[PDB]
């Protein structure tokens, strides 16, 4: 009989609900339990695929082929479980499915409503996502008090009522602010959030207090008495130097003890040795390298969370503090490539939109001419191919069908204008064919791998042989070899341009061979 | 500039939101203003067509062909305007079209939320429904305090904020209950409802208090003080003897004066002479008949609201008290036609479901053979055709493909089944998946000269509202025609059978369309008036 | 007609409700208007006199003799008016007087409720406090959402309804927090606070947003849209370098223009020259001293707000940055007077409790013997007298009856103890139950000519605020007088000792009253100014 822990937010968003849930999942994984996590989004977008990064950051891609909330990434980085479309869903999906059922007449002339039809669908989806796992952590997006999250709150209240306290808990994340003029932290907004939760029939069992200043014991006593919650169930989670240390801190407060006591589980004591290794390798580096990063929206909130996490994992597998320099592509366009001097490696990840691609073209040109370790991702391989055609094959006007169609040399383009008209929508996991003796083979140490892709425009095979005889290495193709996947430079110390997004499978406790090789090349350059 | 009056419910449902809104609209129409009304349903059903009558009563059919809430009917019966699909919509349709817009990418990578996307959709639909009307009365379904109606309340709050008090009002319907153990009425539930309204930023401007006992002046003063509304803005609307007197009642309390004062409208004084005539001819009848109606769920709440309204309109147009005997078809099946003795006319309307059609067949047989005036609607015409084929032509097993697809004489069926068929039981079955076989909304109908339907409607070509899938089988129609079954009306092009008549009957008319939808209290309906006069002819004579 | 501006708190407490209200009042005073302010405390303590400083800081003493909230002090420091007991009250006093009215039968057998009896009492007290002022700023203690402040919010809602928008505003203080992990400020808690305000029928008219980080324009646009207030009605009030610049800050955002536009007032443009001078002389000092203050709870939140304000006023009046060293008396007791080395002046203010008086005795001794300027307040004068009797007259065990009633030389005690006594330890003990022994509020004080206090105050008869029970024992005073202890000031009738001075000291003044209560930033205080100039004389010279 599966058991559920519900996670909610309070006062203000951006508390770290996903990080705390993933930390708990890692903690219980260290105890031998099989843990799974779910994300419920209180917006009526069917999937986050259409959503821009300005709203809720990046759009994570799972192995089964779903564009999900970025929090799922944290999940895969804290437990070794593969996430599918069942572990993340939205209010819009629920409403659309119930509308389709009602149009199908499955309700037999009944007044379909939020209660009980919508809540029934939400509960069914939650149970389906839980699967066979011993414990499922269901995170609720948004903050309590918003009317968008009320269906989720009612559904979890119904679940708590139906399966009892032995199989359900409420971990509510709330912020205690430090008021500078008063020189102390205030628990009043937390009390207001707890009152809001009580007014909807939900009594939190654990309170996670977030603050940028220490949370003292007297405040914990007051917050425990003013919410009718046992003292040890008041967890203080402050701003930390690294997220991977959060499982330690929580363990130091016996919250996993509370979970196992409430659920009546029998398993061994938590072994956090691996996370201790991660935190030790993060806070105590030995080497140091600065890697450039060029794109469109770099410092945007959680816009490239998976990519930065992957590069941190690569630097942590090699004990290097990977300093990052973020340069906008338009800065390179209107100022020249001179902003890139002094770096030891250059990265071009997937760009959001169409503006400022000539800047990335100049960037890959500068990286390849100056023999600086270059790794391109998605749009990176596309701009690398375009630049290589421009500066080796001499096609000055070579471009892609994404951008200005005034291009007599479309080295990258949609399949339809080859061999409107819809879109390929190349999304999800796919099989790969590496080439022997290449850098990709030198890193992956195999010829068959499974990685995730989020592209639509591919490399045109019409002009492929001309580039192939021009020196452009084809170090990887699709699972059948039909399309170009990853390319390399012939006379470069390290130059890989891949269509897929490898940063999604990178974890802190295992790293990623390609990113590790990129970091090692960066150290080889100067470090 | 369009002006809006919002209508809300409180305490409990079934207060009469639609009736009160329609009465106010009638009052304003009597002042010369051009009024329209809208109905917003807080359920996620796309349209009420799939909904059973057990939930929210009948399913009205508009002229443009939409299945809407029954309240729209009230609208057309209180002002002389025509409702379209823009005048009624639901949370389900709003959510579905917003989801389709999001899938189209029309939001350009934006987080679609209840606020402001859903509220924007609701407001746009309100504006589109309002049209060029001087005043639009927007009614909100459900009761205040349910989470289902929160988007609508938020949208009307945004409207109030955006266009100001000179173009917006809130008329909130509440219930003051009479506590028998205390011998007085309590204002506490109304105060709680007003508190719930205040919690969502909505302050009522007019209060319509509903009770089965008189609402005394001290209660009005307390309810105005405890909710910070002027005394004259508290309207007492008790259970009345007939709904058509509510326009008078409200007019006696200066509700229209309040509307005109707030909106700054310049119009003539209210003239309720037509409604006075209606109430006088409804409350003081001179003649009296007893008309039987056999059906499926007769006494169910508001299941046949439009048809009973049509009968009331026919009765008032003739100053006759049409007492009605509701009989279940299964009762006729298990007890015989002897339950029909003593009536002056017999009705078989559209049936809700498939159970007990044989009862209606026997009812049609008894009505025809004993020369008792009969009018059939939708299923009524179908069962009339089936019974006529059974008892005249000798086709004992004749039926409709709705009930028996193995019948050797399918006198009623879908168009595809007998469109191009050799004859007899050439039913292609397979459920005839077409979807559009359901004729819905206004369609033309040509009436043969010299028939009862032509005598009533008095025009050669009429227009009426359809809601039906099963038609008359044209491959066997000539045999019925030469057997004496009169075809008194056909479709706008003549391809399909519309209204039929008996050959040797004082009055026997069966129409496929629903005439009760275009029946109004101030104008009546020629068909129902003729049917009631036929019952008057039968009364006393037989 | 009196006009009201209401001030409320949100999210968390300690936003600066009183400071913001006083700053707005100062702005309006600069326009020539006659402003007053009121403080409404949502606790059932009758007056804050019994309350400890740990709860809500110091206990202010008004001229008429009332123990009030510290916020009243801010009032007197921002406009040149005097606060009375009508300008501050609590839920406890309202409930107690309503209960007394009910016991008197003044309600004539009526069910006394929160609405309308308590609200009526609160409104009447608001009107009485407002007086003849053109504008009254009524501040509500606590944070919106607590059930303790609901009566006050309901009362101000009733006021808004009754006198209209032309005589009422709501300026709501809220907190926008900077989330370090997100690198931006969140408006969600403010929106929740506004929702809580809307749930009780209160719509804010001005929003004062408080943060430690800049409030960008997009946040202001979002916070105005999501709460349906005009953009110019969103005021950004961040943590400032000094509070006296808030009148400038708000004036730069047209808050006074909003107040004038809403209330329809006709007055001259704001002239903040005095506040500009204050901020310039506070933020850009030229000299610098370090003054020691030894006490009981020195760094406690707002425990000595008026006294630190008085020191700031004295410093700005002399363009000197008065750095302050806070030292606990017990630290002096257990470590010696060596913690005092390096300072230019020494202060011993009124003590909160009875612990560590020997430390203050040693502090007075060290200040006198080493010719370091000393000013004592309330307990300061008492310990000065005790130390002078101990170390000059040789009365080693001399003390006050507050701490030692068995002392053979009670140089300080209650009036009844030595009123008619033979001499020496004729203490009647029994706690001297009088209640009125506590001198409170404004009393006169005659100053001897040619003394330091007369040089500072420059007048023969002054008026100052008292809060003290223990007086100087007149049965032993002549011995102190002939021992060299100067009696530089006595009561309005001369019966009691008020201010004393050392005979061979550069500056040594000990006053029984509290001068910090009448100290203002735009006018300073002669006593504190003289003390700071004495420290300036000591600085460099010694």
UniProtKB/Swiss-Prot annotation, chains B, C:
Allosterically activated by GTP, when glutamine is the substrate; GTP has no effect on the reaction when ammonia is the substrate. The allosteric effector GTP functions by stabilizing the protein conformation that binds the tetrahedral intermediate(s) formed during glutamine hydrolysis. Inhibited by the product CTP, via allosteric rather than competitive inhibition. Residues 1-265 are annotated as: Amidoligase domain. Its EC number is 6.3.4.2. InterPro entries: Class_I_gatase-like, CTP_synthase, CTP_synthase_N, GATASE, GATase1_CTP_Synthase, P-loop_NTPase. This is CTP synthase. It catalyses: UTP + L-glutamine + ATP + H2O = CTP + L-glutamate + ADP + phosphate + 2 H(+); L-glutamine + H2O = L-glutamate + NH4(+); UTP + NH4(+) + ATP = CTP + ADP + phosphate + 2 H(+). Pathway: Pyrimidine metabolism; CTP biosynthesis via de novo pathway; CTP from UDP: step 2/2. PANTHER family: CTP SYNTHASE (PTHR11550), CTP SYNTHASE-RELATED (PTHR11550:SF0). The keyword DNA damage does not apply. NCBIfam families: PRK05380.1, PyrG. The gene is pyrG. UTP binds at residues 13, 186-191, 222. CTPSs have evolved a hybrid strategy for distinguishing between UTP and CTP. The overlapping regions of the product feedback inhibitory and substrate sites recognize a common feature in both compounds, the triphosphate moiety. To differentiate isosteric substrate and product pyrimidine rings, an additional pocket far from the expected kinase/ligase catalytic site, specifically recognizes the cytosine and ribose portions of the product inhibitor. Belongs to the CTP synthase family. Keywords: ATP-binding, Glutamine amidotransferase, Ligase, Magnesium, Metal-binding, Nucleotide-binding, Pyrimidine biosynthesis. Homotetramer. Residues 290-541 form the Glutamine amidotransferase type-1 domain. CTP binds at residues 13, 146-148, 186-191, 222. It comes from Pseudomonas aeruginosa (strain ATCC 15692 / DSM 22644 / CIP 104116 / JCM 14847 / LMG 12228 / 1C / PRS 101 / PAO1). GO terms for molecular function: ATP binding; CTP synthase activity; glutaminase activity; identical protein binding; metal ion binding. Mg(2+) binds at residues 71, 139. One of its GO terms (cellular component) is cytosol. One of its GO terms (biological process) is CTP biosynthetic process.
